[PDB]
Design an enzyme around this catalytic site. Structure first.
Site, PDB file in Angstrom:
ATOM      1  N   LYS A   1     -15.093   8.263  -1.114  1.00 54.79           N
ATOM      2  CA  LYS A   1     -16.088   8.829  -0.011  1.00 54.79           C
ATOM      3  C   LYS A   1     -16.885  10.154  -0.568  1.00 54.79           C
ATOM      4  O   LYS A   1     -17.955  10.103  -0.447  1.00 54.79           O
ATOM      5  CB  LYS A   1     -15.629   8.814   1.230  1.00 54.79           C
ATOM      6  CG  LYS A   1     -14.918   7.593   1.861  1.00 54.79           C
ATOM      7  CD  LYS A   1     -14.419   8.048   3.362  1.00 54.79           C
ATOM      8  CE  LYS A   1     -13.564   6.862   3.530  1.00 54.79           C
ATOM      9  NZ  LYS A   1     -12.835   6.953   4.838  1.00 54.79           N
TER      10      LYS A   1
ATOM     11  N   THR B   1      -8.741   6.668  -0.273  1.00 59.35           N
ATOM     12  CA  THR B   1     -10.091   6.121  -0.185  1.00 59.35           C
ATOM     13  C   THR B   1     -10.963   7.302   0.166  1.00 59.35           C
ATOM     14  O   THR B   1     -12.556   7.279  -0.098  1.00 59.35           O
ATOM     15  CB  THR B   1     -10.295   4.960   0.721  1.00 59.35           C
ATOM     16  OG1 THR B   1      -9.716   5.313   1.801  1.00 59.35           O
ATOM     17  CG2 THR B   1      -9.606   3.713   0.359  1.00 59.35           C
TER      18      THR B   1
ATOM     19  N   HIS C   1       0.705  -1.285   0.003  1.00 60.18           N
ATOM     20  CA  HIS C   1       0.095  -0.130   0.002  1.00 60.18           C
ATOM     21  C   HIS C   1       0.763   1.316  -0.019  1.00 60.18           C
ATOM     22  O   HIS C   1       0.439   2.426   0.359  1.00 60.18           O
ATOM     23  CB  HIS C   1      -0.724  -0.031   1.370  1.00 60.18           C
ATOM     24  CG  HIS C   1      -1.773  -1.238   1.752  1.00 60.18           C
ATOM     25  ND1 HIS C   1      -2.921  -1.085   1.432  1.00 60.18           N
ATOM     26  CD2 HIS C   1      -1.359  -2.488   2.261  1.00 60.18           C
ATOM     27  CE1 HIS C   1      -3.540  -2.253   1.658  1.00 60.18           C
ATOM     28  NE2 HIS C   1      -2.426  -3.026   2.233  1.00 60.18           N
TER      29      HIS C   1
ATOM     30  N   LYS D   1       0.795  14.777   1.573  1.00 56.00           N
ATOM     31  CA  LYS D   1      -0.398  14.795   1.210  1.00 56.00           C
ATOM     32  C   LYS D   1      -0.831  16.351   0.781  1.00 56.00           C
ATOM     33  O   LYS D   1      -1.773  16.791   0.350  1.00 56.00           O
ATOM     34  CB  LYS D   1      -1.410  14.289   2.362  1.00 56.00           C
ATOM     35  CG  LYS D   1      -1.534  12.941   2.171  1.00 56.00           C
ATOM     36  CD  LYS D   1      -2.293  12.549   3.538  1.00 56.00           C
ATOM     37  CE  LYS D   1      -2.252  10.945   3.827  1.00 56.00           C
ATOM     38  NZ  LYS D   1      -3.312  10.258   2.817  1.00 56.00           N
TER      39      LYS D   1
ATOM     40  N   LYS E   1      -7.919  14.110   6.240  1.00 55.17           N
ATOM     41  CA  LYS E   1      -7.011  12.759   5.919  1.00 55.17           C
ATOM     42  C   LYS E   1      -5.793  13.000   6.950  1.00 55.17           C
ATOM     43  O   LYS E   1      -5.469  14.144   7.586  1.00 55.17           O
ATOM     44  CB  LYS E   1      -6.281  12.739   4.465  1.00 55.17           C
ATOM     45  CG  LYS E   1      -5.570  14.156   4.098  1.00 55.17           C
ATOM     46  CD  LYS E   1      -5.404  14.288   2.672  1.00 55.17           C
ATOM     47  CE  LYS E   1      -6.440  14.389   1.701  1.00 55.17           C
ATOM     48  NZ  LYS E   1      -6.713  12.901   1.051  1.00 55.17           N
ATOM     49  N   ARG E   2      -4.801  12.133   7.024  1.00 54.24           N
ATOM     50  CA  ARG E   2      -3.517  12.226   8.317  1.00 54.24           C
ATOM     51  C   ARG E   2      -2.816  13.368   7.642  1.00 54.24           C
ATOM     52  O   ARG E   2      -2.650  13.732   6.230  1.00 54.24           O
ATOM     53  CB  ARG E   2      -2.960  10.730   8.113  1.00 54.24           C
ATOM     54  CG  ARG E   2      -3.685   9.830   8.945  1.00 54.24           C
ATOM     55  CD  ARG E   2      -3.755  10.249  10.405  1.00 54.24           C
ATOM     56  NE  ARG E   2      -2.700  10.187  11.009  1.00 54.24           N
ATOM     57  CZ  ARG E   2      -1.998   9.207  11.887  1.00 54.24           C
ATOM     58  NH1 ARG E   2      -2.731   8.137  12.096  1.00 54.24           N
ATOM     59  NH2 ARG E   2      -0.759   9.520  12.215  1.00 54.24           N
TER      60      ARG E   2
END
Ligand SMILES: O=C1NC(=O)[C@@]2(N1)O[C@H](CO)[C@@H](O)[C@H](O)[C@H]2O
Ligand SMILES: O=C1NC(=O)[C@@]2(N1)O[C@H](CO)[C@@H](O)[C@H](O)[C@H]2O
Lengths: 813, 813
Positions: A658, A654, A355, A552, A546-547
């Site tokens: 959503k 993911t 992943h 990111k 998100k984290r």
């Protein structure tokens, strides 16, 4: 009550069922809780409901498990060090079709079921995407009727609860078990031993692992209900127990019990602590004892040849990679099979899912640690490595550097075992989690392995369950869809493609818009109530949740936010589409830059949210304690979904799916599953911007120079000068010097390289938002093509292409 | 089933009740346990029964507690660091009159209820007599209808399980909670904070205890049923919880949680560990917060004057003595009462019970420890001491040595607080636990205090509940008594005096004897089954079971045993009454001499039990793991009860009363409650021997010289020479040198001084045993005069003479 009533997707409130549910609520309140209506609190009523709802799972759970034992289908063992399950009461009532009946039953009792659902603690046994994928996978496996077993560890403390104090993150232990967990069932009778340390004796019976220390593994089993099919599978999580002067010896039982105490809070980063390695082997060892016992009680040298016909082991990341050498240890040392036959069996039984992309997210354990803690496993790994490098040498004769690159053993001051290479050597299938990531695994990351064994390499694009991530969290949207195409899409999400017939339907356009507005009102009420934050309901809700991780790029979102603020201040009279920019997410404790990023978000808000010129045209808030129950409230309320990782770094994502299923438009890079999402909806219905992976590589080839961007973009220079001079930290002018230094001189993620196209793309977002009708029509084009992103599609492809078992929607009696 | 059926004291098996019980057993097996009849084990069936039985306590528990809150009677708070409750399933069914109905219900299901009862773990939260007294007291308080609350700590590990390995004790953690405790109810909602360390700030509001560390106290409440009166009181035990880098901080929560981890295993010996002091304050602090909250919600400056009218605090030993200064701290620092009014209230609320004589059993905590851990409490204790020594000085002017003797503060290299003196100063009543002990407290131990305040000093002879210690453990005997005098004696034990009418009744004589023989057969079957030890059923069962301690003189019993063995070997052809001498009991870990005593018992058996000349005429066995569930099996089987402490050392004893109620004759010294037992039955019906307390004192006055006894008694010299020369330890000839050295030169308990009269008395025992009819007639005279030794008599006198509340046998609806 009225909308709840009206929502036909919530089932029927049959009159005898409502009567029985009430009776059983009162029975549990008295006999189970030992309470009475005069002293009972909302928490007591939540527990009485939860126990009532749980009784409905029991017969199906016993019948399902008995059916597997009778029928003896191949069993799927999904091993994971994380299961981010969230809350279970509403999910249980949705899957069993009890939601409107319980809503009515509680309403007749004078209670509000939605208030009672808010008492439940998330079960937050995961860090983010990977733990949440494992939880959507257990739901999809039950809905598809597979004989599947999730196996993990029952952490006493999951990911910490995040408090924000003085604009900084603070970590508090998440004591999720304080009021008990009514869903699990303790199974102390099935406790098993797990061994550590010791040494190997080589005798005439082969090897013998002796002088070990024992820790007991006690299982706790939690039911996993499929969607209206009467299937109830099991999640079994193991809890550490000490084996069976004096006071201090009793107190020292805590050392062994500390194996299941707390989840390591890292996301895309390997921390090589001994305690984590213990957690990993503890899950693997207890789990393989159950697998072997169940196999021996099944059908029937006869037995082990058929082991891979009756067992699949699915490794979630390399965290349970020790199952490869543990299975060989059991088969050779204890069952007495010869090495070759044992390896044949092991490779056909196991499969690995990768992943990540970043080198520091891969598990590389010091050989000295493995030698001390698991001496027989290290022997077995060296033997596995010698036979695999012999195959490499025969396939590519004379390629000495290939042998060094592919070895399970990595050289250096500290020699290490590369657990990813161990999984590839010992698995019959390896897959990534989105087409771009699976392809990069074959082309770069594991290119030598792909050249040796190309048939092993697969793709399984990630998905999310449309039960929790549409029916539960956004019933309004679930209902307007059901009004037009029935309920079948809930367990066959590709039927959402029927919604493309309504892109010009005035009622549907009207109702999609109405549902989004209602969700924005519900979200704003939750924020005022629980955290006392006020947001403008008539603003575009721009959400990045998100984290927190440099890859990111929450920082790229910060640069945009300050750009909007500076543009307003330069031309105060000019109309701009009002926005509420929300960013939330946890930082690993210890990840300094991620902690400073959270403080920068709060600091920006401290200036922006109090500037009278801006007024309610722009608000920037940090959402505290982002977690599955909060994602279920904020995602359905969102207008814009921020998916802005540097191209090539998000393996799939993911949260992107959503948001797409819940009526938000996406602004994103061509990264992870965003590429497939844009393909499915049509790129004209997505806001794609920035470097592609080929561009990032070209920049790496000539050298990324952030100064060039600073020198050429006046608006960027202005923000950097604000940050550096203390504009967002007047009492501590140099507070953000480390963020600036990184951005200017050591940014591995090229924040400044996408700044200009990001800000231009954001303007295109704003322009569409000024035309509500065409914004909504582009939303309908997204919801209607979100069907591929169901986890049922992903699990059906694991079943058929890896596990060799056929998924089914046939109902159990 | 047949005897169970026949036993009318076990109640009725009404047909609808049997039907309902079966239904509910199956319901719990399915919904609660999630099991099915094909996989269910005897353990699963025990749990299904326990949950079924528990449901019958619920309505009475809620109604009783609601009745107290409505009616507002004075509440009794019984504070204890030990509650040795034993098993609860049978006790619950006896008190609710469910025993024959459950026996029938389980029989119809194909199960044996007695086998299921054996699965239960004792709840062994106590060391011996004092913990077991607290458990008989909670039963008697519920049977007498008092609004009483037992308050303690929920140890995760009670007294260790004793294994015997190579004839030595080995300690294993007693993990009594492994399969859960179905009786308690977790009450996390009522968790309260307890403070430690910190410092005192003296301001203008008075003192302020600040900068403390918090440990949470979570209560677990267990029902306590009265005998057929529908009263169900509560035992609330507190469990330690940590308050609300990162990984290590989560793991370090164990340090605070270690307060409730394990019971200190000392019996009549004070070990001054900081962790024990923490356990003590933790119980006191949480418990007084409940007391104060309940008082404030009751009736109604108005309030605290009436506090002692609505509250009694009963201190079991000085273990919860910190309640005296904690109550003053709450009343003065938090409620703002003036010192004088607060002290008035405190003394009328509290009462202390003393249970020991030996100086090293008294609690004396270093002032430095109290200063560090509980600085405000030490301030309060010094103030209490200054005002009490001012009263001493005004009452006995110029008696300077009296001030030094009575001070709460003891001098020495380490200054200490004498907690017994603190309790006497702060209580309105002080009592000992048997007439001889209460009298020695006034005459010697606390003679200065008695002279200052003679009205404070009382006696409360101990007792035992005739529910657990006659109906439950010896139903056969309970039934033959009921056949003649009805069932009223079960809650009015003085009615056993009616049995003196049957001393010449041939059927009764016959049946007492028959019941004892059946119990000896049941005990011998249990021993063969569970521990694989074979005993001769036609031998006199001579039993000494109690903690191992030099003052209880298991060694004197060893000397007798070897005397019988040596006499047999000298005259092998001479008939002797066959005996099975059994000794059992735990040694504190760390108490060396007690550990060597256990090894001597096993070693004697190793010689004696394998000598062909002796054959089955003499067997000596050590009974492993003596504990409440084992006392319930071995006491009813006993013929001779050994109660041989040195005169003046056993404060009361309670095992002595158990044996008297169960048909054993006693061989004993005039010590503790043995004196009152002999008075009640008539000394001719007891085997009293040895020094009285006056004799022990005369020997201390001239000096105890063990050599004199060795020189004058040939048979004693022979045994000492056997022990010293290695006759009982041939492979390690000097093994028992330490026991010999102690006996010969440092025996504080004068073992040799009672040897000759002990052996003569034992011969008188044997002579009576050869005449079964007259042995049985003397047994009937004992059972019939055991009535004073009911704990209901003892608790009725605490209620009337200390608590100011009237006991009642009136049934609740
Ligand atoms: O270590 C990881 N944490 C993740 O969330 C992750 N890898 O796994 C997820 C599930 O496959 C991915 O969607 C996500 O892109 C990746 O970062
Ligand atoms: O510390 C003690 N442990 C006991 O068993 C004890 N004191 O208390 C009991 C209950 O009052 C007494 O019967 C026993 O004599 C005494 O030793």
């Amino acid at each position: 009550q009225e909308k709840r009533k009206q929502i036909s997707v919530r089932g029927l409130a049959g009159v005898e069922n409502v009567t029985e549910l009430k009776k059983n609520f009162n029975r549990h309140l008295h006999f189970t809780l030992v309470k009475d209506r005069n002293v009972a609190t909302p928490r007591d009523y939540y527990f009485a409901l939860a126990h009532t709802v749980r009784d409905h799972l029991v017969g199906r759970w016993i019948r399902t498990q008995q059916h597997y034992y009778e029928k003896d289908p191949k069993r799927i063992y999904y091993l994971s060090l994380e299961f981010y399950m969230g809350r279970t009461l509403q999910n249980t009532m949705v899957n069993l079709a009890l939601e409107n009946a319980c809503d009515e039953a509680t309403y007749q009792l004078g209670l509000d079921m939605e208030e009672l659902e808010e008492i439940e603690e998330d079960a937050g046994l995961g860090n983010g995407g990977l733990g949440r994928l494992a939880a959507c996978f257990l739901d999809s496996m039950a809905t598809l009727g597979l004989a599947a077993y999730g196996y993990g560890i029952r952490y006493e403390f999951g990911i910490f609860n995040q408090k924000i104090c003085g604009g900084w993150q603070m970590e508090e232990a998440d004591d999720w078990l304080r009021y008990g967990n009514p869903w699990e069932k303790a199974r102390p009778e099935f406790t098993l031993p797990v061994h550590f340390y010791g040494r190997v004796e080589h005798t005439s019976q082969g090897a013998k692992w002796v002088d070990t220390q024992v820790v007991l593994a006690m299982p706790y089993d939690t039911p996993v209900p499929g969607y209206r099919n009467n299937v109830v599978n099991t999640m079994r999580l193991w809890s550490a127990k000490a084996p069976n002067g004096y006071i201090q010896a009793v107190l020292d039982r805590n050392l062994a019990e500390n194996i299941s105490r707390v989840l390591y809070p890292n996301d895309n980063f390997f921390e090589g602590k001994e305690l984590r390695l213990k957690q990993e082997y503890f899950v693997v060892a207890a789990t393989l004892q159950d697998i072997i016992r169940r196999f021996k009680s099944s059908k029937f040298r006869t037995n082990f040849d058929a082991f891979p016909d009756k067992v699949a082991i699915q490794l979630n990341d390399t965290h349970p990679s020790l199952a490869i050498p543990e299975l060989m240890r059991v088969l050779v040392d204890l069952e007495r099979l010869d090495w070759d036959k044992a390896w044949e069996v092991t490779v056909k039984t196991c499969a690995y899912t990768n992943h990540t992309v970043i080198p520091e997210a891969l598990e590389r354990w010091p050989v000295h640690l493995l030698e001390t803690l698991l001496p027989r496993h290290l022997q077995i790994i060296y033997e596995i490595n010698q036979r695999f490098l012999n195959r490499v040498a025969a396939a590519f004769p004379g390629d000495v550097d290939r042998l060094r690159r592919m070895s399970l053993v990595e050289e250096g001051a500290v020699k290490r075992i590369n657990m990813a290479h161990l999984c590839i050597a010992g698995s019959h299938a390896v897959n990534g989690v989105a087409r771009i990531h699976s392809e990069i695994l074959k082309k770069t990351i594991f290119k030598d392995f792909y050249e040796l064994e190309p048939h092993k390499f697969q793709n399984k694009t990630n998905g999310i369950t449309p039960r929790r991530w549409l029916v539960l969290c956004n019933p309004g949207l679930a209902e307007i869809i059901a009004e037009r195409i029935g309920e079948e899409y809930i367990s066959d999400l590709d039927q959402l493609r029927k919604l493309l017939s309504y892109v010009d339907d005035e009622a549907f356009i009207r109702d999609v818009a109405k549902v989004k507005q209602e969700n924005k009102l519900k979200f704003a009420a939750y924020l005022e109530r629980e955290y006392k934050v006020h947001i403008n309901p008539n603003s575009l809700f721009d959400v990045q949740v998100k984290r927190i991780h440099e890859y990111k790029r929450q920082l790229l979102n910060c640069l945009h936010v300050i750009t909007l603020y500076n543009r307003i201040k330069k031309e105060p009279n000019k109309f701009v589409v009002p926005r509420t920019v929300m960013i939330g997410g946890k930082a690993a404790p210890g990840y300094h830059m991620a902690k400073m990023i959270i403080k920068l978000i709060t600091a920006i808000g401290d200036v922006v949210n109090h500037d009278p010129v801006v007024g309610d045209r722009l608000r920037v808030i940090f959402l505290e304690n982002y977690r599955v129950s909060l994602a279920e409230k904020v995602i359905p309320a969102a207008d814009l979904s921020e998916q802005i990782s540097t191209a090539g770094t998000e393996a799939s994502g993911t949260g992107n799916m959503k948001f797409m299923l819940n009526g938000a438009l996406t602004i994103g890079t061509m990264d992870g599953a965003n590429v497939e999402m844009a393909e499915e909806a049509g790129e004209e219905n997505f806001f794609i911007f920035g470097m592609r992976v080929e561009d990032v590589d070209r920049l790496d080839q000539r050298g990324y120079n952030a100064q060039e961007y600073y020198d050429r973009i006046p608006e960027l220079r202005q923000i950097i000068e604000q940050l550096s001079s203390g504009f967002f930290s007047p009492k501590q002018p140099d507070l953000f010097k480390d963020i600036v230094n990184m951005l200017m001189h050591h940014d591995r993620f090229k924040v400044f390289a996408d700044y200009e196209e990001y800000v231009k793309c954001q303007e295109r977002v704003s322009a569409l938002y000024k035309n509500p009708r065409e914004w909504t029509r582009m939303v309908i084009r997204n919801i209607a093509t979100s069907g591929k992103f169901s986890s049922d599609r992903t699990i059906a492809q694991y079943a058929r292409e890896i596990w060799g078992v056929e998924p089914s929607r046939q109902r159990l009696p």
